Design a protein around this nucleic acid. Structure first.
Ligand SMILES: [Cl-]
Ligand SMILES: [Cl-]
Ligand SMILES: [Cl-]
Ligand SMILES: [Cl-]
Ligand SMILES: [Cl-]
Ligand SMILES: [Cl-]
Ligand SMILES: [Cl-]
Ligand SMILES: [Cl-]
Ligand SMILES: [Cl-]
Ligand SMILES: [K+]
Ligand SMILES: [Mg+2]
Ligand SMILES: [Mg+2]
Ligand SMILES: [Mg+2]
Ligand SMILES: [Mg+2]
Ligand SMILES: [Mg+2]
Ligand SMILES: [Mg+2]
Ligand SMILES: [Mg+2]
Ligand SMILES: [Mg+2]
Ligand SMILES: [Mg+2]
Ligand SMILES: [Mg+2]
Ligand SMILES: [Mg+2]
Ligand SMILES: [Mg+2]
Ligand SMILES: [Mg+2]
Ligand SMILES: [Mg+2]
Ligand SMILES: [Mg+2]
Ligand SMILES: [Mg+2]
Ligand SMILES: [Mg+2]
Ligand SMILES: [Mg+2]
Ligand SMILES: [Mg+2]
Ligand SMILES: [Mg+2]
Ligand SMILES: [Mg+2]
Ligand SMILES: [Mg+2]
Ligand SMILES: [Mg+2]
Ligand SMILES: [Mg+2]
Ligand code: NA
Ligand code: NA
Ligand code: NA
Ligand code: NA
Ligand code: NA
Ligand code: NA
Ligand code: NA
Ligand code: NA
Ligand code: NA
Ligand code: NA
Ligand code: NA
Ligand code: NA
Ligand code: NA
Ligand code: NA
Ligand code: NA
Ligand code: NA
Ligand code: NA
Ligand code: NA
Ligand code: NA
Ligand code: NA
Ligand code: NA
Ligand code: NA
Lengths: 337, 174, 132, 144, 165
RNA sequence: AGCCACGCCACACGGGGUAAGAGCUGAACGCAUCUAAGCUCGAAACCCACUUGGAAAAGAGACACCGCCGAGGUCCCGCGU
RNA sequence: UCGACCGAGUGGCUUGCUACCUCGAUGUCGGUUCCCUCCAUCCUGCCCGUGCAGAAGCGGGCAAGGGUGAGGUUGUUCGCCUAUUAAAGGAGGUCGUGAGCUGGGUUUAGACCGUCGUGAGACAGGUCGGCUGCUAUCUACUGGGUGUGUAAUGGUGUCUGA
RNA sequence: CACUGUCCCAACGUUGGGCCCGGUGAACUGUACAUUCCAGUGCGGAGUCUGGAGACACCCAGGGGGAAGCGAAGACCCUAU
RNA sequence: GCCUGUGUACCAGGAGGGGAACAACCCAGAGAUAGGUUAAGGUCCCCAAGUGUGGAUUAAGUGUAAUCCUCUGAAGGUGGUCUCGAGCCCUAGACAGCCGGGAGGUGAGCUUAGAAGCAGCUACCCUCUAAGAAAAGCGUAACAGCUUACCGGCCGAGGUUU
């Protein structure tokens, strides 16, 4: 009597509404086991191509043989860690304490912030160290931003600004490590945080679909057979039982679909290069040509071309890193045709 | 009621709040003894367990506290010792101490080692097919001994046929 | 089961009529069920290259007809993907009758078998003329 | 939160029975007093931990679209306990309630006072739980 | 097997008069006198009774299951010719109706069976035994009280001082 | 081209506390006893972990800089992630 | 492991009883689609016993997180049957769900057959045909805006986490 | 048998609407109040009673869970000298 | 929360105070206005008045529920715990535990191939003793072997039946 079947779509990604921030904000950070280091990076989505690879999986019967793998090319020029923020531990949880800022700024950063003309870094740094001595110091993160002007395919000169955690080492060593990076002007690269063959989590705001119906948005069935000709095609049977007499939020309905934040786990970094190697004949469709620092990600990444995406080291990897996998071939074939 | 426990020779007993500590040549044991309206105190050379309450539940805990303390006396002087014997039929079982855990390899031919972590200051000493488990705290030692036996438990097969395991042989007295 | 070493889009359903490629005397087979397969509400049980399927003989010798047997799908029209990314597809859909031990019921196979079917059934591969 | 409440009364809930304190704090707030309840995490509820915990777990569990929002943290739980003793929907009730604040630990310089009748004797009782323990069980992040 | 919840209460008038009631089913009770019938009750040092603690109706099928399960135990223990006697004192005089086969039209029930009315505090069973066998009658009675509606008291009415000590 | 699935990528360890259960120490009841106080373990279930939303959380939050005759924002113009 | 007799109960899924609610109408059965729930658990996890060697079982405990599918006859619910399956559990939500669908059945007006009737006609007996209205005021929810409060100094950017 | 989007399982596209703007411009319905939700109670099927929970106001689009929604002094059933 | 009597008081046609709400349960029968004091029912907060007093019980959040469609909980269990009895044993040392001793005729007779305390039938004597069965229960093919009865010691204050 009515075979069962799972509900339509997950309830874990709700409410499905427009993201308030087109720059994604990481909900979690990797653990502190390693040496002091910045816990993420960012870049701009270009497109897709494929790659022939040598299977490095020790547990595959195909180990050593060639495999074709899909890749999303992301332009990953260096970013600037322009400040160091410290969090205090309080009964209400973590709160920003103070910030140590550089005096050295990229020319376009004033399109976004009101850049400090007058700051006292040492005072801030002192406040931080006093906190550490009191054992109230709870976290250390860098205020960082991208340099889209270094990516001509992307129309924006206005930088995207995001805060990224610094993990690893003792708190003291971590503090020093953070301060060293910032004072320079903060310039750092994909090279510095990530190595090819490692797993990253990639976060991004998905392609916007605007308003869509429950069939697309939730995966409910279309009306079937005779039912499909009666005046109803794409609508669900009912909004609920007689009682409770109200519509539950769990029933699939139309609404904003796409343009949500997603964090996708365990994305293998196939290569971190620079130059025009990955670029496709004719240009990446609706994007442009890539010549410059880039990252190849196994498979797919959330978002349309030009969208900012964020990297962090995998917080829950299934597999051991197999470093620097061998790339036999990278297709430059036109994506038109 | 009131019960008095004469502290034995070369043993010291200190009581801080609801904690009592017992020191001897074999070591030190501290215990929380906490039950409504039962006072445990060190007066001179005698430990005193008392309550204004005579009810069955109170007497129960009093008798329990007495035996707990006496066991502590025994543990810091004479010590506590459990004997254990490994038996196997077909697959030779390797039983060793690695750090703070005792490890069992090739149990019933299993590729994966079985492990248990030793409680407290308990010592596990293996000689051939014999083990001895020992220490000052009878709680820790008894449990460590038990964990070793329990570690060879098998739910899925007839135990009368599959008897392999480490078993407690000698159990302490007094 | 053992990995096929290929990604399959199942091209067959419960009820599909396919070629019996072998000398058993069964000509046409009707798919009935797919071994180890569980679907979902309203979904037609689906079978493809390298699946073991329960089968019914619709066309053939009188003695083979109406019989309910097991078989293995050795060819399908819907493409499959090989590890180098290329797609492979056949001219028909074909299965080979097999016993409880997965040994072919007949002494001869008719037409090509997909290489991946060897990664699963040795006896069937062995009896193959051509493997692609 | 960290806002520096000016209290006519600072109550120490440490080893005190939550409902007996709450009842007294409720009446004082309706009497015009501003009240700070301090060390909420160390406040106490008598009885069998397992049934106590089931009750509070049920409250976290219950809910719907309209919503039942039940606090996991010790300060929240204490606050809600007090709200139940006030006509908090009426004006004088909401005013009294907003004159009361509960704190994890003691943000004040002075120790609080122990209200009569509220104190639990740990030497006479093993069946009870601390609010802190309840919150940990409920899954609260322990900041105290 | 209709449940006793239907019949166990005394709510109804006494309905006993066979001159006005026909088709009354026979009782399922085999015997009211058990053990040694030729022997006087007073020959025994020990007298034990099962006392009913609530006023109720016990129907004849329940009396028989109860009697049976008690006497079977005595026979199994003291032996078929064993030295003892047991009396079931009550007889099922009250006639029972059921409205079966209309609904509540002409609802007066057809005759379905019989029950014994027992006032609280009365002796249902009385057993007479030798001192050595007294725990065997207590046990028989325990089995017997499980087969009837009310809670029961087991009482030694003669020779308790001889029992145990 | 785009949009799509029939195409492709990714989606858990582990820890904590328990139930049934297996035990330790242990009285009441000099013994015995997994339980009465105490403790060691132990479920796809509970909590954390992970993803999503979330300053209207009325205790309506934090930090840094910029600005209060001017920071910044809206309108406008060319467009579309 | 099965378990009679008798005795005591729990549920509110069947059936019956009652006639308390509605006859200025609370739209039927079955199905469908979509959502939530219960546990007396079919599978899965952890266990106990065995007439437990193993393997395969049987019986029981905790446990509702997830799963419990596809077809042939029949309007059917139910049920029978087939091949698969870890298993293809059972209930409640106005016997959930017609301002959502369907309209095969019951139960209008046409007609035939059987039975009954002098007859008009009837049956609870079978059979063929036989309609599905409404532009959403409120509430409810899914998504999207505009304002106010926070704020007797605004803003930019980054965060916190009840 | 043949055929096929009836189905697996849905996609993309075409035309007219829908959405925004100018102009034209009705009707149904309305005891009152009305931001509700979970339970309870009540003539036993409550937005309005009771206890709690939740709830800043206004507006746009949606598909129709509830107002035992609107529409018709029930055709069924009984009763009427 | 059914049908149908009967006596009575109530609702209907009865306010006001209790009872969370609530025709008939409790108080109460009521002109207006005003000051007192009570009734039912309450006195930790919501909420007027006690975190009242002297005792005792309960650990189950039992319970904080007069009456009731409305507040369930039964038969049957319970070394959970508290209280009140009765009998017997005990500092001439009880109850339990631990240690020691449980001997010889004799492996009783019969049966039986052998039946040795212990397959079965019958008998169930006698010595040495502080005490020890012609054996109360495991155990063996049958003897081993392990206990129980029974006695002594250690210990020291209640124990045991009901
Ligand atoms: Cl449909
Ligand atoms: Cl991984
Ligand atoms: Cl199938
Ligand atoms: Cl909620
Ligand atoms: Cl209020
Ligand atoms: Cl206590
Ligand atoms: Cl249908
Ligand atoms: Cl009057
Ligand atoms: Cl409670
Ligand atoms: K009607
Ligand atoms: Mg239609
Ligand atoms: Mg292309
Ligand atoms: Mg091409
Ligand atoms: Mg087995
Ligand atoms: Mg279907
Ligand atoms: Mg309706
Ligand atoms: Mg259950
Ligand atoms: Mg569920
Ligand atoms: Mg229905
Ligand atoms: Mg249903
Ligand atoms: Mg409807
Ligand atoms: Mg309709
Ligand atoms: Mg309509
Ligand atoms: Mg029809
Ligand atoms: Mg028809
Ligand atoms: Mg028809
Ligand atoms: Mg009601
Ligand atoms: Mg309300
Ligand atoms: Mg009418
Ligand atoms: Mg008519
Ligand atoms: Mg009237
Ligand atoms: Mg007051
Ligand atoms: Mg209760
Ligand atoms: Mg009552
Ligand atoms: Na239509
Ligand atoms: Na249509
Ligand atoms: Na309806
Ligand atoms: Na309490
Ligand atoms: Na809640
Ligand atoms: Na009739
Ligand atoms: Na009974
Ligand atoms: Na765990
Ligand atoms: Na704010
Ligand atoms: Na009924
Ligand atoms: Na009406
Ligand atoms: Na229906
Ligand atoms: Na489940
Ligand atoms: Na069927
Ligand atoms: Na209905
Ligand atoms: Na319908
Ligand atoms: Na309709
Ligand atoms: Na079409
Ligand atoms: Na509606
Ligand atoms: Na009157
Ligand atoms: Na009232
Ligand atoms: Na309660």
């Amino acid at each position: 009597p009515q075979p069962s079947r799972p509900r339509k779509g997950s309830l874990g990604f709700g409410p499905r509404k427009r993201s308030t921030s087109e720059t994604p904000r990481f909900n979690s950070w990797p653990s502190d086991d390693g040496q002091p280091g910045v816990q993420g990076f960012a870049g701009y989505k270009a497109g897709m191509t494929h790659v022939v690879l040598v299977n490095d999986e020790p547990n595959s019967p195909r180990e050593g043989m060639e495999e074709t793998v899909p890749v999303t090319v992301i332009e990953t020029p260096p970013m600037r860690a322009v400040a160091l923020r410290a969090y205090e531990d309080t009964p209400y949880g973590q709160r920003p304490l103070t910030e140590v800022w550089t005096d050295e700024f990229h020319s376009e950063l004033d399109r976004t912030l009101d850049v400090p003309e007058d700051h006292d870094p040492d005072a801030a740094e002192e406040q931080i160290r006093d906190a550490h001595e009191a054992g109230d110091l709870g976290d250390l993160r860098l205020i960082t931003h991208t340099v889209p002007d270094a990516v001509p395919s992307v129309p924006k000169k206005k930088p995207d600004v995001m805060e990224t955690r610094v993990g690893g080492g003792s708190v003291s060593d971590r503090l020093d490590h953070a301060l060293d990076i910032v004072e320079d002007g903060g310039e750092h690269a994909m090279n510095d945080i990530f190595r090819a063959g490692e797993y990253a989590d990639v976060a991004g705001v998905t392609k916007g679909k605007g308003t869509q119906g429950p069939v697309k948005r939730w995966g409910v069935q279309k009306r079937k057979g005779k039912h499909a000709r009666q005046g109803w095609r794409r609508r669900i049977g009912n909004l609920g039982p007689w009682n409770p007499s109200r519509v539950r939020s769990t029933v699939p309905q139309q609404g904003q679909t796409g343009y949500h934040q997603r964090t996708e786990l365990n994305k293998r970094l196939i290569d971190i290069g620079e130059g025009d190697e990955p670029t496709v004949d004719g240009g990446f469709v609706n994007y442009g040509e890539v010549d410059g620092p880039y990252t190849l990600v196994k498979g797919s990444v959330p978002g349309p071309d030009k969208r900012l995406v964020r990297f962090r080291p995998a917080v829950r990897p299934n597999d051991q890193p197999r470093l620097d996998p061998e790339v036999r071939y990278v297709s430059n074939e036109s994506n038109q045709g | 009621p009131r019960v008095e426990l004469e502290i034995p020779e070369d043993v010291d007993a200190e009581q801080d709040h609801l904690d009592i500590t017992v020191e001897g040549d074999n070591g030190s044991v501290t215990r929380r003894l906490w039950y409504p309206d039962i006072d445990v105190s060190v007066d001179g050379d005698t430990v005193v367990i008392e309550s204004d309450e005579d009810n069955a539940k109170t007497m129960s805990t009093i008798g329990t506290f007495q035996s707990h303390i006496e066991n502590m006396f025994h543990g810091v002087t004479e010590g506590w010792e459990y004997g254990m014997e490994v038996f196997y039929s077909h697959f030779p079982m390797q039983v060793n101490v690695e750090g703070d855990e005792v490890v069992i390899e090739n149990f019933l031919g299993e590729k994966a080692p079985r492990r248990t972590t030793i409680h407290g200051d308990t010592d596990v000493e293996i000689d051939g097919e014999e083990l001895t488990v020992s220490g000052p705290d009878i709680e820790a030692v008894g449990q460590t001994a038990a964990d070793i036996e329990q570690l060879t438990r098998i739910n899925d097969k007839d135990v009368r046929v599959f008897q392999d395991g480490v078993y407690i042989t000698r159990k302490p007295n007094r | 089961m053992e990995a096929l070493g290929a990604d399959v889009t199942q091209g067959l359903e419960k009820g599909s009529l396919i070629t019996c490629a072998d000398n058993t005397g069964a000509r046409e087979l009707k798919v009935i069920s797919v071994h180890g397969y569980s679907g979902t509400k309203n979904r037609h049980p689906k079978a493809g290259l390298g699946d073991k399927i329960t089968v019914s003989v619709t066309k053939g010798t009188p003695e083979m007809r109406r019989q309910v047997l097991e078989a293995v799908v050795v060819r399908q029209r819907k493409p499959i993907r090989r590890p180098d990314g290329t797609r492979v597809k056949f001219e028909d859909n074909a299965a080979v009758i097999v016993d409880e031990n997965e040994d072919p019921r007949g002494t001869e196979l008719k037409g090509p078998i997909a290489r991946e079917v060897a990664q699963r059934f040795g006896s069937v591969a062995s009896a193959a003329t051509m493997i692609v | 939160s960290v806002a520096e409440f000016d209290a006519d009364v600072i109550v120490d809930a440490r080893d005190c029975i939550m409902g007996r304190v709450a009842s007294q704090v409720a009446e004082q707030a309706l009497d015009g007093e501003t009240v700070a309840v301090v060390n909420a995490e160390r406040a106490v509820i008598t009885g069998r931990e397992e049934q106590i915990v089931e009750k509070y777990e049920k409250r976290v569990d219950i809910g719907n679209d309209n919503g039942y929002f039940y606090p996991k943290r010790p300060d929240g739980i204490f606050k809600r306990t007090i709200r139940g003793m006030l006509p908090h929907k009426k004006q004088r009730g909401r005013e009294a309630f907003e004159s009361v604040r509960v704190y994890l630990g003691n943000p004040y310089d002075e120790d609080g006072e122990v209200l009569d009748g509220t104190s639990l004797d740990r030497l006479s009782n093993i069946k009870f739980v601390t609010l802190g323990e309840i919150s940990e069980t409920l899954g609260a992040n322990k900041t105290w | 097997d209709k449940p006793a919840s239907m019949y166990r209460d005394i709510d109804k008038p006494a309905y006993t008069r066979r001159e006005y009631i026909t088709g009354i089913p026979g009782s399922k009770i085999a015997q009211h006198k058990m053990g040694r019938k030729q022997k006087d009750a007073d020959d025994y040092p020990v007298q034990i009774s099962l006392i009913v603690e609530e006023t109720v109706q016990l129907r004849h099928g329940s009396l028989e299951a109860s009697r049976l399960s008690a006497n079977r135990h005595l026979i199994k223990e003291l032996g078929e010719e064993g030295d003892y006697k047991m009396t079931l004192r009550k007889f099922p005089h009250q006639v029972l109706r059921e409205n079966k086969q209309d609904g509540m039209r002409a609802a007066f029930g057809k005759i379905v069976g019989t029950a014994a009315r027992v006032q609280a505090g009365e002796q249902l069973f009385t057993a007479y035994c030798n001192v050595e066998d007294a725990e065997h009658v207590k046990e028989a009675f325990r089995r017997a009280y499980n087969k009837i509606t009310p809670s029961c008291r087991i009482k030694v009415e003669r020779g308790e001082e001889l029992l145990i000590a």
